[PDB]
Amino acid sequence: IFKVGDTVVYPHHGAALVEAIETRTIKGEQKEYLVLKVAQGDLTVRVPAENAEYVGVRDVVGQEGLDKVFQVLRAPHTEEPTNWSRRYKANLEKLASGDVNKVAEVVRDLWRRDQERGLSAGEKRMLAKARQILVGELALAAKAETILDEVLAAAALEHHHHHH
Amino acid sequence: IFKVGDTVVYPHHGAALVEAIETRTIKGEQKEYLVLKVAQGDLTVRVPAENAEYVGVRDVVGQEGLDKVFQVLRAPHTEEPTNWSRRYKANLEKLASGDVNKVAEVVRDLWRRDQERGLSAGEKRMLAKARQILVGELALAAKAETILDEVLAAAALEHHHHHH
């Protein structure tokens, strides 16, 4: 599917914030445009609101929280306990921690182990549990929870290195 | 669907280049990892090659070409002839120009007019034609041509402003 020198379209998911909704009169009707703060924000994106299919994320998480979740999932050099019990215990606490960043460490570590060493039965179940927790915290109050779960999962497998 | 202060996941599509494929021994088998140059590149993304679903784009276009196509589609302040004939003539030449950036001006201008004033019959047909040309130039030699057409179309409607 790939080889050195190939070009591909890479979807750079990150948080965006709706900073303004500008209203215009179009075809007799009132149609909204979003003004999005993107990339912290070095980027402003303006886009028709009916042509916008961006998955929402809860206010309590917010733009910094969301970007923080991505940063955790994509961290390249992690440390996890070598022994199963140690590893399992520390994850179990994280899932109970009430800190969604902690939950994202669990989702990330276990997704990556699944791809490389494979998972034990308990570890498989914990990954599923952690995934539901991650999503339930971010998703707005089902096809969103599914897209969000795929995006976060894709992010878990990507190691991001910044070098400006 | 939206309101000021909302947080959403924004997919920042852009070109990425495969700069290395590193090989590891996993579960007895040989499994590849991609090293992607992203954002020109201030970003390196490393990701398992079996877990990579990035649409390919032809070498003759390349990473700069692809990023150039995006920049054209997302240009915020365009000028297009006010009169139909003037507008139609200049677009017709662009589609014949053999410059894919020219084709992307046509795809962008006409998508945006469709959302705001609506299209004449000839303009509708030209937009369809321009879309097939844009895709055929980028896509590798059908579900890719469809994803690529959606991504480029989504990009046509977004105005991007940079402010670092």
Short mmCIF file of C-alpha atoms in Angstrom, two decimals:
data_model
loop_
_atom_site.label_atom_id
_atom_site.label_comp_id
_atom_site.label_asym_id
_atom_site.label_seq_id
_atom_site.Cartn_x
_atom_site.Cartn_y
_atom_site.Cartn_z
CA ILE A 1 0.00 0.00 0.00
CA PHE A 2 2.99 2.33 0.62
CA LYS A 3 6.55 3.09 -0.33
CA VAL A 4 9.14 5.74 0.29
CA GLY A 5 8.48 8.92 -1.66
CA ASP A 6 4.70 8.39 -1.79
CA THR A 7 2.43 11.41 -1.28
CA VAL A 8 -0.80 11.03 0.71
CA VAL A 9 -3.56 13.18 2.15
CA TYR A 10 -2.98 13.42 5.90
CA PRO A 11 -5.99 14.50 8.07
CA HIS A 12 -4.59 16.57 10.90
CA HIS A 13 -7.27 16.32 13.53
CA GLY A 14 -7.18 18.85 16.36
CA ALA A 15 -9.54 21.04 18.39
CA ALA A 16 -11.35 23.97 16.83
CA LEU A 17 -13.49 26.56 18.54
CA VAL A 18 -16.48 28.41 17.04
CA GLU A 19 -15.54 32.08 17.69
CA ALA A 20 -18.27 33.67 15.59
CA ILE A 21 -21.28 32.73 13.52
CA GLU A 22 -21.74 35.39 10.83
CA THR A 23 -25.15 35.64 9.21
CA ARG A 24 -25.82 36.35 5.55
CA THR A 25 -29.02 36.67 3.49
CA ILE A 26 -28.91 33.92 0.82
CA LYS A 27 -31.62 32.97 -1.68
CA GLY A 28 -34.07 34.88 0.52
CA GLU A 29 -33.12 32.78 3.56
CA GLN A 30 -30.74 33.37 6.49
CA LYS A 31 -27.65 31.19 6.33
CA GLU A 32 -24.92 31.02 8.93
CA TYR A 33 -21.13 30.87 8.51
CA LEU A 34 -18.77 29.57 11.16
CA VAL A 35 -15.54 31.38 12.10
CA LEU A 36 -13.27 28.67 13.52
CA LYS A 37 -10.19 29.11 15.69
CA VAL A 38 -7.77 26.37 14.67
CA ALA A 39 -4.21 25.44 15.64
CA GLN A 40 -4.14 27.44 18.89
CA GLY A 41 -4.96 29.55 16.73
CA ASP A 42 -2.52 30.37 13.94
CA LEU A 43 -5.39 29.49 11.65
CA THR A 44 -8.84 30.92 11.13
CA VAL A 45 -11.19 28.84 9.03
CA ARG A 46 -14.44 30.26 7.75
CA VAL A 47 -17.00 27.75 6.40
CA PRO A 48 -20.77 27.53 5.64
CA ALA A 49 -22.60 26.06 8.64
CA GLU A 50 -24.76 23.69 6.55
CA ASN A 51 -21.60 22.37 4.89
CA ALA A 52 -19.98 21.70 8.27
CA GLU A 53 -19.71 18.16 9.52
CA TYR A 54 -17.40 18.55 12.52
CA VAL A 55 -17.96 16.31 15.49
CA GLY A 56 -18.76 18.28 18.64
CA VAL A 57 -16.98 17.82 21.98
CA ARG A 58 -18.28 18.86 25.43
CA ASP A 59 -17.71 22.37 26.81
CA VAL A 60 -16.30 21.02 30.09
CA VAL A 61 -13.43 19.59 27.99
CA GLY A 62 -13.14 22.62 25.72
CA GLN A 63 -10.57 23.47 23.05
CA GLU A 64 -7.46 23.18 25.30
CA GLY A 65 -8.76 19.99 26.88
CA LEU A 66 -9.41 18.46 23.45
CA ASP A 67 -5.98 19.46 22.12
CA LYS A 68 -4.55 18.07 25.38
CA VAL A 69 -6.31 14.75 24.79
CA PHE A 70 -4.70 14.57 21.33
CA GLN A 71 -1.31 15.37 22.69
CA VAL A 72 -1.54 12.55 25.25
CA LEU A 73 -2.67 10.01 22.65
CA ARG A 74 0.13 10.94 20.25
CA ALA A 75 3.01 11.20 22.78
CA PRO A 76 5.92 9.28 21.17
CA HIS A 77 8.02 8.21 24.15
CA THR A 78 5.90 6.79 26.94
CA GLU A 79 6.82 4.75 29.97
CA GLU A 80 4.63 1.85 31.10
CA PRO A 81 5.35 -0.74 33.87
CA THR A 82 6.99 -3.85 32.41
CA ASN A 83 5.13 -6.33 34.64
CA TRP A 84 1.46 -7.16 33.98
CA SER A 85 0.16 -6.60 37.54
CA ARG A 86 2.05 -3.29 37.93
CA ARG A 87 0.78 -2.19 34.54
CA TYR A 88 -2.80 -3.35 35.19
CA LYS A 89 -2.95 -1.73 38.65
CA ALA A 90 -1.72 1.66 37.51
CA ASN A 91 -4.20 1.67 34.60
CA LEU A 92 -7.07 0.62 36.83
CA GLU A 93 -6.46 3.66 39.03
CA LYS A 94 -6.22 6.02 36.04
CA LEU A 95 -9.66 4.89 34.78
CA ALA A 96 -11.01 5.69 38.26
CA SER A 97 -9.00 8.95 38.46
CA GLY A 98 -11.65 11.25 36.98
CA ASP A 99 -8.84 12.85 34.90
CA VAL A 100 -9.67 12.29 31.22
CA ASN A 101 -6.00 12.76 30.36
CA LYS A 102 -5.29 9.71 32.54
CA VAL A 103 -7.97 7.75 30.67
CA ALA A 104 -6.27 8.71 27.40
CA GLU A 105 -2.96 7.33 28.65
CA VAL A 106 -4.73 4.00 29.15
CA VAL A 107 -6.44 4.06 25.75
CA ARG A 108 -3.09 4.95 24.07
CA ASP A 109 -0.84 2.41 25.88
CA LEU A 110 -3.22 -0.49 25.36
CA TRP A 111 -4.00 0.26 21.67
CA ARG A 112 -0.26 0.28 20.99
CA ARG A 113 0.40 -2.94 22.86
CA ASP A 114 -2.48 -4.53 20.92
CA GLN A 115 -0.68 -3.72 17.64
CA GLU A 116 2.74 -4.92 18.86
CA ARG A 117 2.65 -7.63 21.58
CA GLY A 118 -1.11 -8.31 21.62
CA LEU A 119 -3.44 -8.04 24.66
CA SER A 120 -4.31 -10.33 27.59
CA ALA A 121 -8.04 -10.95 28.08
CA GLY A 122 -8.26 -8.47 31.00
CA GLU A 123 -6.24 -5.94 29.06
CA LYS A 124 -8.56 -6.31 26.08
CA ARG A 125 -11.57 -5.65 28.32
CA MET A 126 -9.87 -2.66 29.95
CA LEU A 127 -9.07 -1.13 26.55
CA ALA A 128 -12.75 -1.44 25.64
CA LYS A 129 -13.77 0.10 28.93
CA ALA A 130 -11.26 2.93 28.62
CA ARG A 131 -12.46 3.65 25.11
CA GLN A 132 -16.11 4.05 26.27
CA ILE A 133 -14.96 6.33 29.09
CA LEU A 134 -12.82 8.49 26.81
CA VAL A 135 -15.72 8.87 24.33
CA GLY A 136 -18.45 9.44 26.93
CA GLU A 137 -16.42 12.26 28.44
CA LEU A 138 -15.84 14.00 25.07
CA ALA A 139 -18.94 13.22 22.97
CA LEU A 140 -21.98 15.50 23.23
CA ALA A 141 -25.16 14.14 24.89
CA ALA A 142 -23.99 7.52 18.63
CA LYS A 143 -22.64 8.00 15.11
CA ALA A 144 -20.61 10.75 16.78
CA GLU A 145 -19.39 8.40 19.50
CA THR A 146 -18.35 6.05 16.69
CA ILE A 147 -16.45 8.66 14.63
CA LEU A 148 -14.92 10.07 17.81
CA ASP A 149 -13.81 6.55 18.87
CA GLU A 150 -12.18 5.96 15.46
CA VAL A 151 -10.41 9.32 15.47
CA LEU A 152 -9.11 8.94 19.00
CA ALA A 153 -8.05 5.36 18.19
CA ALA A 154 -6.27 6.41 15.03
CA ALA A 155 -4.56 9.13 17.08
CA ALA A 156 -3.40 6.57 19.68
CA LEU A 157 -1.31 4.79 17.08
CA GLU A 158 0.35 7.91 15.68
CA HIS A 159 3.54 9.19 17.28
CA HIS A 160 3.82 12.94 16.80
CA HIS A 161 7.13 14.77 16.87
CA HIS A 162 7.27 18.57 16.71
CA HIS A 163 10.22 20.36 15.22
CA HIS A 164 9.73 24.01 14.19
CA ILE B 1 -26.05 22.33 14.95
CA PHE B 2 -23.66 25.09 16.12
CA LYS B 3 -23.25 28.06 18.40
CA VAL B 4 -20.55 30.40 19.55
CA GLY B 5 -18.20 28.81 22.06
CA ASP B 6 -18.74 25.26 20.75
CA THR B 7 -15.73 22.95 20.49
CA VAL B 8 -15.42 20.58 17.52
CA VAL B 9 -12.91 18.19 16.00
CA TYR B 10 -11.43 19.89 12.94
CA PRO B 11 -9.69 17.62 10.34
CA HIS B 12 -6.79 19.60 8.95
CA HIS B 13 -6.15 17.93 5.64
CA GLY B 14 -2.82 18.63 3.95
CA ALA B 15 -0.07 16.79 2.04
CA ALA B 16 2.17 14.27 3.76
CA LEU B 17 5.18 12.51 2.33
CA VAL B 18 6.43 9.00 3.25
CA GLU B 19 10.10 9.69 4.14
CA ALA B 20 10.90 6.28 5.60
CA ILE B 21 9.32 2.90 6.13
CA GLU B 22 10.94 1.32 9.21
CA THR B 23 10.63 -2.43 9.59
CA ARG B 24 10.07 -4.30 12.84
CA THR B 25 9.69 -7.99 13.70
CA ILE B 26 6.21 -8.43 15.25
CA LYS B 27 4.48 -11.67 16.26
CA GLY B 28 7.02 -13.50 14.09
CA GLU B 29 6.05 -11.40 11.05
CA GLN B 30 7.58 -8.30 9.42
CA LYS B 31 5.47 -5.20 9.91
CA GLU B 32 6.18 -1.79 8.46
CA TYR B 33 5.89 1.67 10.05
CA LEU B 34 5.55 4.87 8.07
CA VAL B 35 7.57 8.01 8.88
CA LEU B 36 5.49 10.90 7.53
CA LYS B 37 6.63 14.43 6.77
CA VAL B 38 3.71 16.70 7.62
CA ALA B 39 3.15 20.46 7.65
CA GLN B 40 6.12 21.33 5.42
CA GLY B 41 7.38 19.64 7.73
CA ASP B 42 7.23 20.97 11.28
CA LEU B 43 5.64 17.64 12.08
CA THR B 44 6.81 14.07 11.84
CA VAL B 45 4.15 11.43 12.27
CA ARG B 46 5.06 7.80 12.77
CA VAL B 47 2.25 5.24 12.32
CA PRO B 48 1.79 1.47 11.66
CA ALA B 49 1.40 0.86 7.93
CA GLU B 50 -1.53 -1.58 8.32
CA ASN B 51 -3.33 1.03 10.43
CA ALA B 52 -2.83 3.70 7.76
CA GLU B 53 -5.75 4.74 5.62
CA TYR B 54 -4.38 7.81 3.86
CA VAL B 55 -5.50 8.47 0.32
CA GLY B 56 -2.59 8.49 -2.12
CA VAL B 57 -1.90 11.27 -4.64
CA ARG B 58 0.22 11.02 -7.81
CA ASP B 59 3.99 11.60 -7.74
CA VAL B 60 3.81 14.11 -10.61
CA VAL B 61 1.76 16.31 -8.24
CA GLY B 62 3.86 15.53 -5.17
CA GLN B 63 3.77 17.02 -1.68
CA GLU B 64 4.24 20.69 -2.73
CA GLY B 65 1.76 20.32 -5.56
CA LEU B 66 -0.82 18.80 -3.21
CA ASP B 67 -0.33 21.50 -0.58
CA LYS B 68 -0.54 24.02 -3.43
CA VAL B 69 -3.87 22.55 -4.54
CA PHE B 70 -5.20 23.00 -0.99
CA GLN B 71 -3.98 26.54 -0.81
CA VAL B 72 -5.79 27.44 -4.05
CA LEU B 73 -9.05 25.84 -2.92
CA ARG B 74 -8.98 27.62 0.45
CA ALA B 75 -7.89 31.10 -0.77
CA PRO B 76 -10.24 33.55 1.04
CA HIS B 77 -10.25 36.58 -1.25
CA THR B 78 -10.66 35.62 -4.88
CA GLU B 79 -11.58 37.67 -7.91
CA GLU B 80 -13.93 36.28 -10.56
CA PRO B 81 -15.45 38.12 -13.59
CA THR B 82 -18.87 39.56 -12.73
CA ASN B 83 -20.46 38.78 -16.11
CA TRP B 84 -21.46 35.20 -17.01
CA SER B 85 -19.74 35.04 -20.44
CA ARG B 86 -16.50 36.58 -19.11
CA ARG B 87 -16.59 34.18 -16.17
CA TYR B 88 -17.46 31.14 -18.31
CA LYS B 89 -14.78 31.91 -20.92
CA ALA B 90 -11.97 32.33 -18.43
CA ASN B 91 -12.93 29.09 -16.67
CA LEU B 92 -13.17 27.19 -19.94
CA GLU B 93 -9.57 28.13 -20.73
CA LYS B 94 -8.34 27.15 -17.26
CA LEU B 95 -9.83 23.64 -17.64
CA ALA B 96 -7.91 23.37 -20.93
CA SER B 97 -4.77 24.96 -19.41
CA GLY B 98 -3.10 21.75 -18.25
CA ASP B 99 -2.29 23.56 -14.97
CA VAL B 100 -4.05 21.68 -12.15
CA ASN B 101 -3.89 24.82 -10.02
CA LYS B 102 -6.03 26.51 -12.67
CA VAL B 103 -8.51 23.62 -12.53
CA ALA B 104 -8.70 24.08 -8.75
CA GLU B 105 -9.58 27.75 -9.19
CA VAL B 106 -12.55 26.61 -11.27
CA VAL B 107 -13.63 23.92 -8.80
CA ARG B 108 -13.35 26.45 -5.91
CA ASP B 109 -15.14 29.42 -7.57
CA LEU B 110 -18.05 27.34 -8.82
CA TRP B 111 -18.57 25.35 -5.56
CA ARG B 112 -18.78 28.67 -3.70
CA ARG B 113 -21.20 30.23 -6.16
CA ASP B 114 -23.34 27.09 -5.90
CA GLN B 115 -23.67 27.66 -2.12
CA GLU B 116 -24.40 31.40 -2.44
CA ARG B 117 -26.05 32.48 -5.74
CA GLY B 118 -26.67 29.01 -7.25
CA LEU B 119 -25.39 27.75 -10.64
CA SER B 120 -26.58 28.10 -14.26
CA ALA B 121 -27.00 24.81 -16.13
CA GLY B 122 -23.69 25.25 -18.02
CA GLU B 123 -21.95 26.26 -14.82
CA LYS B 124 -23.29 23.17 -13.07
CA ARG B 125 -21.92 20.97 -15.86
CA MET B 126 -18.56 22.75 -15.80
CA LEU B 127 -18.25 22.27 -12.03
CA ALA B 128 -18.85 18.55 -12.54
CA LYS B 129 -16.29 18.45 -15.33
CA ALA B 130 -13.73 20.40 -13.32
CA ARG B 131 -14.22 18.09 -10.37
CA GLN B 132 -13.46 14.97 -12.50
CA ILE B 133 -10.36 16.68 -13.90
CA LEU B 134 -9.09 17.74 -10.48
CA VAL B 135 -9.57 14.19 -9.13
CA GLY B 136 -8.15 12.37 -12.17
CA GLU B 137 -4.99 14.45 -11.94
CA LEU B 138 -4.48 13.74 -8.20
CA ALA B 139 -5.92 10.24 -7.62
CA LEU B 140 -3.68 7.21 -8.15
CA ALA B 141 -4.40 4.88 -11.11
CA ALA B 142 -12.73 4.75 -7.24
CA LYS B 143 -13.46 4.86 -3.51
CA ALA B 144 -10.31 6.99 -3.46
CA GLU B 145 -11.62 9.27 -6.21
CA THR B 146 -14.77 9.62 -4.11
CA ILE B 147 -13.00 10.47 -0.82
CA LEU B 148 -10.61 12.76 -2.68
CA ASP B 149 -13.57 14.52 -4.37
CA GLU B 150 -15.27 15.05 -0.98
CA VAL B 151 -12.10 16.35 0.67
CA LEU B 152 -11.28 18.73 -2.16
CA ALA B 153 -14.93 19.88 -2.21
CA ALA B 154 -14.99 20.44 1.52
CA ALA B 155 -11.75 22.40 1.12
CA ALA B 156 -13.29 24.60 -1.61
CA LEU B 157 -15.84 25.94 0.85
CA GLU B 158 -13.36 26.73 3.62
CA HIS B 159 -11.62 30.09 3.67
CA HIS B 160 -8.25 29.78 5.37
CA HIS B 161 -6.50 32.73 6.99
CA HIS B 162 -2.97 32.38 8.37
CA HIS B 163 -1.79 34.49 11.25
CA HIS B 164 1.31 33.30 13.15
#
